[PDB]
Structures are given as C-alpha cells and as structure tokens.
DNA sequence: CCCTATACGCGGCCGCCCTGGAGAATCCCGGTGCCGAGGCCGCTCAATTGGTCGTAGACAGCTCTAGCAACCGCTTAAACG
C-alpha cells in the first residue's frame, strides 16, 4: 500500500500483519494505515512491525 | 729545202678556301652611400609610495514567506492514434 491513498473505504478483512516500512509525519495517517486490518470483525491478533 | 698554217703545253693573273691574333662584352670583387631599424637622451606628467581617515560591506541575529520533493485525489479538456 501507499499510505495516504484510498481513504477509509478499503477492506482488508483477510489481513493479519501490518508492516510500516516508512513512518509518517502525521501519526493519524499511520493509525489509519494499520487500521485497515484492525476493524470490527477481525478473527486474528493484528500485529504491527515498524 | 724553206715558208706557213696548226694544234698543244703552260708563265702570269685573278678568284676562292682554311686559320690566326687583336679587341669587345660579361661576371665577380672591393669600396662606398642610402633606407629601415635599433639604441640613447631629454622633457615631463601621471603612476607609485606613504600616511590618514571615513565607511561599505561582511557578519551575526531574529522574523515571515516562497519554494521543493514526493505523494494524494478529482475533473476535464487537450493530446494522440
């Protein structure tokens, strides 16, 4: 993913691990980045590696 | 036996072919005069040297705004085949 694209309407139910390669200046952008897989209904423990 | 015409060799004069010494034209050398260029001298004024002083600009500091790299997203009119 590019971090600042698509808005909040992107669906990633099947994902489990989120790797932030590049940290953003705005932490809300990173929050919506690993919030793509950590929404309501996730069946697995979401883990983020920065 | 003597005179007289007769054909034949040729002393002298004139013209033609071959070679030698004197003079004239030419090239080289030495002395000398003139043009281009280089060196020297005289004036002479502007560059040089020394000192003084004002200030132009470098430096530092603080504040605000434009630019820049790299990304996004939407519209739509322009570019392209």
UniProtKB/Swiss-Prot annotation:
Q: Domain annotation text? A: The 2 chromodomains are involved in the binding to the histone H3 methyllysine at position 4 (H3K4me3).
Instruction: Summarize the protein's role.
Output: ATP-dependent chromatin-remodeling factor which functions as substrate recognition component of the transcription regulatory histone acetylation (HAT) complexes SAGA and SLIK. It recognizes H3K4me. SAGA is involved in RNA polymerase II-dependent transcriptional regulation of approximately 10% of yeast genes. At the promoters, SAGA is required for recruitment of the basal transcription machinery.
Highest taxon in the source lineage: Eukaryota
Misc note: Present with 1620 molecules/cell in log phase SD medium.
Q: Where in the cell is it found?
A: Nucleus
Q: What interactions and quaternary structure are annotated?
A: Component of the 1.8 MDa SAGA complex, which consists of at least of TRA1, CHD1, SPT7, TAF5, ADA3, SGF73, SPT20/ADA5, SPT8, TAF12, TAF6, HFI1/ADA1, UBP8, GCN5, ADA2, SPT3, SGF29, TAF10, TAF9, SGF11 and SUS1. TAF5, TAF6, TAF9, TAF19, TAF12 and ADA1 seem to be present in 2 copies. SAGA is built of 5 distinct domains with specialized functions. Domain I (containing TRA1) probably represents the activator interaction surface.
Q: Which residues form a coiled coil?
A: none
State the deletion phenotype: Decreased sensitivity to the cytotoxic effects of 6-azauracil.
Family that this chain belongs to: Belongs to the SNF2/RAD54 helicase family.
Name used for this protein in its record:
Chromo domain-containing protein 1
The shown residues of the full protein are 769 to 818 of 1468
């Amino acid at each position: 993913l590019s971090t600042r694209a698509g808005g909040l309407g992107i669906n990633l139910m099947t994902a489990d691990t989120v790797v932030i390669f590049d940290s953003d200046w705005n932490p809300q952008a990173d929050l919506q980045a690993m919030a793509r897989a950590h929404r309501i209904g996730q069946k697995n423990h979401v883990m983020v590696y920065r």
